[PDB]
Amino acid sequence: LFRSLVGTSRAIQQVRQMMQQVADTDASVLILGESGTGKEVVARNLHYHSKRREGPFVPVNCGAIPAELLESELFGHEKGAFTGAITSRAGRFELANGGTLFLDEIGDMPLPMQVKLLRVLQERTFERVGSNKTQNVDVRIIAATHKNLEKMIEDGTFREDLYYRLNVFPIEMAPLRERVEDIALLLNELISRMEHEKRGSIRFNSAAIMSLCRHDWPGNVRELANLVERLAIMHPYGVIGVGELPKKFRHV
Amino acid sequence: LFRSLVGTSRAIQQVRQMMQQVADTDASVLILGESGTGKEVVARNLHYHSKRREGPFVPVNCGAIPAELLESELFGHEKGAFTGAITSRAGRFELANGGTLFLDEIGDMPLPMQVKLLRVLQERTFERVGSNKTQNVDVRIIAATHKNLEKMIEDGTFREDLYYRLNVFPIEMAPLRERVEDIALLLNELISRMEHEKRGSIRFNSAAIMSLCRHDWPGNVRELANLVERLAIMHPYGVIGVGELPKKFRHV
Amino acid sequence: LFRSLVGTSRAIQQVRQMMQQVADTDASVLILGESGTGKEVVARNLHYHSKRREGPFVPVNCGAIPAELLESELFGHEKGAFTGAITSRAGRFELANGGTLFLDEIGDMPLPMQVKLLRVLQERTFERVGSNKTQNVDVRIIAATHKNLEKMIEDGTFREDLYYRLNVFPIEMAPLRERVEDIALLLNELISRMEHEKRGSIRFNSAAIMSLCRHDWPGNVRELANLVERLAIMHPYGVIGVGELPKKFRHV
Amino acid sequence: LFRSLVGTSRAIQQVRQMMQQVADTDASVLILGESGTGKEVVARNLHYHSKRREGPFVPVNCGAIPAELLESELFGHEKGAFTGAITSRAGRFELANGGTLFLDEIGDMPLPMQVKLLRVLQERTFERVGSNKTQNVDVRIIAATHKNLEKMIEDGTFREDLYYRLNVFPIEMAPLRERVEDIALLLNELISRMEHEKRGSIRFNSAAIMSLCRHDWPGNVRELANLVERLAIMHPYGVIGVGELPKKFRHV
Amino acid sequence: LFRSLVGTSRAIQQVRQMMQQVADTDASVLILGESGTGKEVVARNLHYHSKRREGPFVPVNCGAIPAELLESELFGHEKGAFTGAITSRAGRFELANGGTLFLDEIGDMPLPMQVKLLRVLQERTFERVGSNKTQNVDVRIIAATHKNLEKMIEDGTFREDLYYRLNVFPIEMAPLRERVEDIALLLNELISRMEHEKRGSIRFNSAAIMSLCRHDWPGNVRELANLVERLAIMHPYGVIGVGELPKKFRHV
Amino acid sequence: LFRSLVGTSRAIQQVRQMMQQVADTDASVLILGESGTGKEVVARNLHYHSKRREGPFVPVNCGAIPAELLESELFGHEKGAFTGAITSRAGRFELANGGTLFLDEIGDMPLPMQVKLLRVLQERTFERVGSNKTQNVDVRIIAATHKNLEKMIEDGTFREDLYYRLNVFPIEMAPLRERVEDIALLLNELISRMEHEKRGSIRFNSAAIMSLCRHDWPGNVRELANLVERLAIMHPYGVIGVGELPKKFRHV
Ligand SMILES: Nc1ncnc2c1ncn2[C@@H]1O[C@H](COP(=O)(O)OP(=O)(O)OP(O)(O)=S)[C@@H](O)[C@H]1O
Numbered sequence A, B, C, D, E, F: 001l002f003r004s005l006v007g008t009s010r011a012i013q014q015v016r017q018m019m020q021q022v023a024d025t026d027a028s029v030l031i032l033g034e035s036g037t038g039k040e041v042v043a044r045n046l047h048y049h050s051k052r053r054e055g056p057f058v059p060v061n062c063g064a065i066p067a068e069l070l071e072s073e074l075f076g077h078e079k080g081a082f083t084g085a086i087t088s089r090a091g092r093f094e095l096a097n098g099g100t101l102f103l104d105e106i107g108d109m110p111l112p113m114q115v116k117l118l119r120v121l122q123e124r125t126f127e128r129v130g131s132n133k134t135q136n137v138d139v140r141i142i143a144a145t146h147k148n149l150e151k152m153i154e155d156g157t158f159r160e161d162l163y164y165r166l167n168v169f170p171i172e173m174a175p176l177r178e179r180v181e182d183i184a185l186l187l188n189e190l191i192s193r194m195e196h197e198k199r200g201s202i203r204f205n206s207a208a209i210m211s212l213c214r215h216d217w218p219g220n221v222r223e224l225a226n227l228v229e230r231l232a233i234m235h236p237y238g239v240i241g242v243g244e245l246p247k248k249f250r251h252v
């Protein structure tokens, strides 16, 4: 249902204390971090330690959904609202009512939805596409981005008004390279995960761990996870030394 | 429905007297000011103290709406007007009839709509897109921009003719840094707002207030508001001294 | 429908006599003048005192229309002519047939349309975009610019051939600062306009008038008009002395 | 369809004899001359006294067409050739097949098209943009410029190879100031033109004619034509003496 | 049912050892390689040497299926789900249950399906289009692309999260030009194939083989295969020397 | 397809012997000479007497192609490589594979392409723009310039490394003025050409020939060719004496 946040680094302790400070509030949470730094983890964990903890967790991938369809997707539509609407459909908002609405890649939202979103957050009311019935919405907002929304705001591609209404309680996730002391504990977490799912088994010696620590980790913790998966096939039930690492990961 | 305008500074008193001078007139109001300086506040307040006060308030975000769709959005369209127009739809103008039409980010209007808008303001007539039925429009115009329309006019990006028809009664909103004497009263307003919505509670001591007063406030009053929100979570039901401020806001 | 041209200055008398000389001819009229000097006024007045006086007046704003769409906008298009042409549409030319076509900001026309325009004026024939049906056009041409077409022609940005076919009968509108003796009569005209529309009422004393006369009037007569509008709100049904002027307009 | 070339000057007689020498040949004609010196006149006249005389006359304005679109415009394109090519279209070349292709402002051709043009002239073959079907082209070339192609060639802005393939038979049009003896006969031609089109009527006395003869005529014969048009409105059905000339044209 | 992988090159031996390492695991396999390099071969071979070896092999061509229909095609639909859904239909996923799902041209997947796919891979649950019944899915994932997914990820056209969940065990197929030592053995394989299907017979001499070895092979091994087919018709039951090669393939 | 090289001068005999020495080699040929001295003639003749003689001849005009587009033009591009690349396109190199690539105006190549070109010549490999697929290239290089590449190299505008890789076998074409003994034979060649194409007929007497011999010929042999073309129109089927020459060409 959720994951804990593993690590001993100052920053990850800070993230945990921050998470606790805000979870049971209904305040808007914006999580920033590079891809695969733990942002969704933080989000679902926030939800199951919140007032929405017995409600729905409803993700929206703002970048993945085509701009022309994003409106219907968030707000639902009436039958005949647009071409291909032989249905009347509840939106992500409607489904998220009483639970959490998790706005991922919020920087990839089109300006048109950024404004529509803010009126929904401010008024707490919405209409399905093609409708004039105003409807009630009770969602806790959580958002995440890997983009620099501040520069976007200067570029004129992200709304400043929306920025401050979403950024009440920012949480910053450090990239893996800036917390290489966490790698061993994260590796224990990932291996243990794999062993419980019956996906295999490995373990790393100390040499191979400090080699991993000089890695730059462009995919951060998700890329660490990937590596655990590949080694489990390449050296099944084996011990991973420098030699068992792919050459890309050996740093000596 | 509306907010009052808090503050004791010369400028904010001047804005209030100006607001009263013009509210119950149907004259075009242009409000200039940096993001989050109170421009919408001024606008809705003007509306509910105007002849449109029992009519509709209909916002248009000129920058948010894609240029190709702005025409339909203001003037409505007939069925088949363009690809995807399986509907006939009333425009923002049509919905604003008898009430107020609030033109926000008016500098972000495309030149093509700037001309079309002016013929509507001058003739007081319009057609839906794809139609030849001329229709009647009775709206009070209110516009707002954070841009320098004068320089835009020299750059050739804003229409001079439209500028003078919109700028009958300019109202200038001072940025927060130029009225730091208002911060305490605005803080009382924002806290009181939060306490009434049951979003929490804080209060600021004098040290922390004058620290806030040396802040530059790039997001102005909306950024002040944001800070009240974050402190309410970081120090719930607490008193905010210099130490309780984020370091970015401590100036001693 | 039209406005008369107010004033006693030599130049404005000259403009009136010139207007009469040419109105009932079908000759091409080019009106030059700074923004807000009366150029459209001259144009519609010419039309309603011409052979087109019972026909259509069809404005084109050459600068306002995006260059990629200007062709269709003047000449119309067939269905499928370009992407988004699910329609077949009559152009500005087609709508102007038998009436007047008023070419405003003609210096802002792209060179590509300058040539296409001239073949239309010379051949008196055109095709809709995407079509090969040649069509007949009977329009009286009136054009206006605030730009220096002669320098444009040397810069290579305005076509010389088009210049002479349009500039058969030039009419020059003096800027307001060069005819400050007209200000009082224009003020009477503008006030009387406002009083008839029920937009309010003022009047200017002699001190305030000669203060206005030392003004430079960058927006010329349209800017004069704007001021009458603002004073009507600032001093409703009042008399405007030097003191009632905004400081920008006091010159003593 | 065409115009004759009026005048008694040595040069204009020379142009006529030259025109006859080359008309019924298929040789490349380059006509040089200042704006409005009769270059198009020479061109269409050449065409209707040529082997293409029952074929198409197809003008291309090399300066007017945007460089990015000039290729498609001359050679046509396939569907999908470039963004916005939902059409397959025949080029100016394809339309000119069997008739004349008149290359006006040939000095304003971009170097990229100068090379492409020459391979077409040499190979006598072309492809539509986005296509690999080679197509046949039978056009007689006529070109005109007011620019100094020789200096352009030294500047590196005009192709030398293209220069010699186009300049087989140069025809030079004298500017009006260098043939002021022609003015009277040209004035008879222009007036007679105007009288036949029912655009009005004037005539010039001898004083006014020799005043015109000391004029420098920057717009040459097209500017002469313009003047006949303005006088027809200023003194309808009148006789034009020195006094009836605009002051700019009085030279005594 | 499957094909073996012919060749003696280091890389092809490496591919075989890699294939064995991972076949009987249920790990996600991503095969990269240019068109016709053996990627499907690797895939079906993996399947019939896997835990799915008695289950279904279910190909999806992500590029071939229209984006609007890809969702239904993978997940199935309910009756009335969309216009034309008079049927209820099992998806590719549903049909692949217990067997292998082979995701070919995975880079040609639309971002909208990339996200939907990942939730299916992570949750291991799905709904038919128009349905709210969650369903179970047990498939082994195999994917293939000729595109550079890493650059796609920077271009923002391929999801990074999906990349790492699919790229657990990458297998790279060398293009034919980089393993020209394999050509002879592959030719023996292809000829033997043809002879068994009774499609004809040839054989290559040594001269013609080393001519083939200097070929660049844009279509790689599938293009090699094509050539064997054409020679079998051009020189039935013949020996193929340099002279019997098409000129495009002679390199001496 | 090609032309022979006419003339009896030492230099032209030397060029012929040089041409034979190198044609059937794959060595890089650099041809230097003033505009219109026979450099392309030498090039195509080299090609049709080479190992590429049944392959493609693919000209590139380094000066004519805009610097920003030269890269794509030589190397091709992938779809989306740059703005306006809705296509994937083969480059001049790709089209020249197995045949000749003729680099004309090689001194007009930008330094950026000079380096990229050399890596292609040295590695014999390339990528389309926006791609990471390395591709094979088999072209014979022929280059031509009228510029002084040595001085360019000192000016720092031409790469020295590229100079020596291109200048393996230099061939120098003498300007026409330095071989005036060839004029008669070249005139026979050009007339005979014209007579075969049915473009007319002339012939020169001895007086007119030696007048031509004192000419300086800035356009060299192409300018000679031009003159034959003009005389064919000015004196159709005539004999050209000193008197029939244009005055510019009479030297007595
Ligand atoms: N501190 C952590 N402790 C344990 N597992 C972690 C931690 N951080 C990340 N992970 C795991 O590493 C992976 C990271 O996944 P996510 O948190 O979903 O990435 P993300 O930051 O949300 O990336 P996006 O797509 O840009 S929002 C998952 O497998 C997590 O379970």
Ligand SMILES: Nc1ncnc2c1ncn2[C@@H]1O[C@H](COP(=O)(O)OP(=O)(O)OP(O)(O)=S)[C@@H](O)[C@H]1O
Pocket: A161, B003, B004, B005, B006, B007, B012, B033, B034, B035, B036, B037, B038, B039, B040, B041, B042, B104, B105, B144, B146, B186, B189, B221, B222, B225
């Ligand atoms: N004088 C004021 N008194 C009380 N509240 C204020 C005052 N000025 C601003 N606010 C509040 O501060 C925030 C400012 O919001 P807006 O007035 O809507 O900003 P804006 O100036 O319209 O910015 P934009 O997007 O560029 S038009 C809102 O929460 C207002 O309620």
Ligand SMILES: Nc1ncnc2c1ncn2[C@@H]1O[C@H](COP(=O)(O)OP(=O)(O)OP(O)(O)=S)[C@@H](O)[C@H]1O
Pocket: B161, C003, C004, C005, C006, C007, C012, C033, C034, C035, C036, C037, C038, C039, C040, C041, C042, C104, C105, C144, C146, C186, C189, C221, C222, C225
């Ligand atoms: N001589 C005049 N008498 C009366 N009203 C005038 C006179 N000149 C201008 N106006 C008024 O002043 C304003 C000037 O408007 P226009 O004539 O439309 O300006 P314009 O010169 O056409 O400017 P553009 O946009 O560059 S073409 C209008 O309100 C006119 O009614």
Ligand SMILES: Nc1ncnc2c1ncn2[C@@H]1O[C@H](COP(=O)(O)OP(=O)(O)OP(O)(O)=S)[C@@H](O)[C@H]1O
Pocket: C161, D003, D004, D005, D006, D007, D012, D033, D034, D035, D036, D037, D038, D039, D040, D041, D042, D104, D105, D144, D146, D186, D189, D221, D222, D225
């Ligand atoms: N010799 C002439 N006899 C009679 N009419 C003439 C003569 N020369 C020019 N004209 C007229 O004067 C005008 C000159 O027009 P064009 O010949 O088209 O000018 P142009 O030289 O082609 O200029 P461009 O745009 O630089 S190519 C036209 O009205 C002609 O009909």
Ligand SMILES: Nc1ncnc2c1ncn2[C@@H]1O[C@H](COP(=O)(O)OP(=O)(O)OP(O)(O)=S)[C@@H](O)[C@H]1O
Pocket: E003, E004, E005, E006, E007, E012, E033, E034, E035, E036, E037, E038, E039, E040, E041, E042, E104, E105, E144, E146, E186, E189, E221, E222, E225
């Ligand atoms: N190593 C090999 N040994 C034997 N046959 C091979 C080998 N590699 C390829 N082939 C054959 O060559 C052809 C290549 O086909 P595929 O493997 O299906 O190509 P592909 O790489 O999957 O291309 P796509 O469409 O981009 S996924 C088939 O006829 C295979 O049987």
Ligand SMILES: Nc1ncnc2c1ncn2[C@@H]1O[C@H](COP(=O)(O)OP(=O)(O)OP(O)(O)=S)[C@@H](O)[C@H]1O
Pocket: D161, F003, F004, F005, F006, F007, F012, F033, F034, F035, F036, F037, F038, F039, F040, F041, F042, F104, F105, F144, F146, F186, F189, F221, F222, F225
């Ligand atoms: N020796 C020759 N014998 C016969 N014809 C020749 C000879 N030299 C030149 N020509 C002809 O004269 C003209 C010269 O053309 P090119 O050889 O193409 O000139 P070029 O030297 O390549 O000039 P550029 O543009 O600077 S590379 C063509 O018509 C040739 O056919």
